């Protein structure tokens, strides 16, 4: 990425609802190249989340995503020996990508019986903004308002 | 390798075809037949009296020019170094630098 100015790989939509954002989500959860078992966990968590929150499977994801979606983040920059944290406005594409990544990482750190349950309860905590994932957007916010002078 | 280490292999081949090819094979198949002689054979004992070097398993595959006991290839009968040397001179038929 020094000289080469590349674009972004347009991935195929979801085989169930046809959502590109969900195709990003299944891949984020996916491990060891097991897409079959990855969508099986995402669909089982969506089936248990929409049922236990009042249908709208696309919208129940969107409510939990709006609370984890960050606006600003810090960028480590060494100017004069010292390392300065510069606050920078995140792009709409990465906004969702960071939001999805923290949902998966927080559900993995949970102690439930299954990943379909771990994901559902993390998506439930995010919908009401009171989980490990919303706190990762909170710590990112406190870091940005602090270094607000070096913007 | 050493001239003595090369000679030791010539002895190991000469004794491999003399006994363990036409005589010791006969007493080893006998020391396996369950149908005949289950206790009084002496074939296991008379196998010991035969020279040690006579066994085919006691032979080491060595580079047919240098005598190298390591990095041998049966296809050419030579070690990786002398294989490469002949390969580049086109002395090995149909052999060339492959890429896929």
């Amino acid at each position: 990425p020094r000289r080469r100015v590349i674009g972004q790989r347009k991935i195929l939509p979801d085989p169930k609802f046809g959502s590109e954002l969900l195709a990003k989500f299944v891949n984020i959860l996916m491990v060891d190249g097991k897409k079959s078992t990855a969508e099986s966990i995402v669909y089982s968590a969506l089936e248990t989340l929409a049922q236990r929150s009042g249908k709208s499977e696309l919208e129940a994801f969107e409510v939990a995503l709006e609370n984890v979606r960050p606006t600003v983040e810090v960028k480590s920059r060494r100017v004069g020996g010292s390392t300065y944290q510069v606050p920078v406005e995140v792009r709409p594409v990465r906004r969702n990508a960071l939001a999805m990544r923290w949902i998966v990482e927080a559900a993995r750190k949970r102690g439930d019986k299954s990943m379909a349950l771990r994901l559902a309860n993390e998506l439930s905590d995010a919908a009401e903004n009171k989980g490990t994932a919303v706190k990762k957007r909170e710590d990112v916010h406190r870091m940005a308002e602090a270094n607000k002078a070096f913007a | 390798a050493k001239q003595s280490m090369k000679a030791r292999e010539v002895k190991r081949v000469a004794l491999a075809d003399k006994y363990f090819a036409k005589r010791a094979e006969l007493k080893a198949i006998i020391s396996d037949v369950n149908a005949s002689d289950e206790d009084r054979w002496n074939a296991v004992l008379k196998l010991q009296t035969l020279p040690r070097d006579s066994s085919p398993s006691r032979q080491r595959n060595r580079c047919r020019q240098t005598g190298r006991p390591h990095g041998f290839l049966r296809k050419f009968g030579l070690s990786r170094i002398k294989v490469r040397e002949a390969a580049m001179r086109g002395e090995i038929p149909g052999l060339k630098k492959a890429s896929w």
């Binding site: - | 020391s31 396996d32 296991v44 004992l45 010991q48």
Partner: protein, 79 residues
């Protein structure tokens, strides 16, 4: 450890075990055969088994039958 189809013993040592039974117990039997399985016809004898440099004399016992002669002659000095 091996196939049940005959336990192994060296002919030069087996003939030395035979000669020691009929002519009576002598001094330690100097043998390098560490690969030979101990037979019941050995119990009571003193077989001097090699270790690489000296011959370790081992008094044969009934519980020693089935085991190799080289188990009772340490090969590596460790102190």
């Amino acid at each position: 450890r091996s196939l049940k189809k005959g336990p192994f013993i060296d002919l030069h040592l087996l003939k030395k075990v035979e000669k020691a039974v009929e002519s009576g117990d002598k001094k330690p039997l100097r043998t390098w055969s560490r690969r030979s399985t101990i037979f019941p016809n050995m119990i009571g004898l003193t077989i001097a088994v090699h270790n690489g440099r000296q011959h370790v004399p081992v008094f044969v016992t009934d519980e020693m039958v089935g085991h190799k002669l080289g188990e009772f002659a340490p090969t590596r000095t460790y102190r």
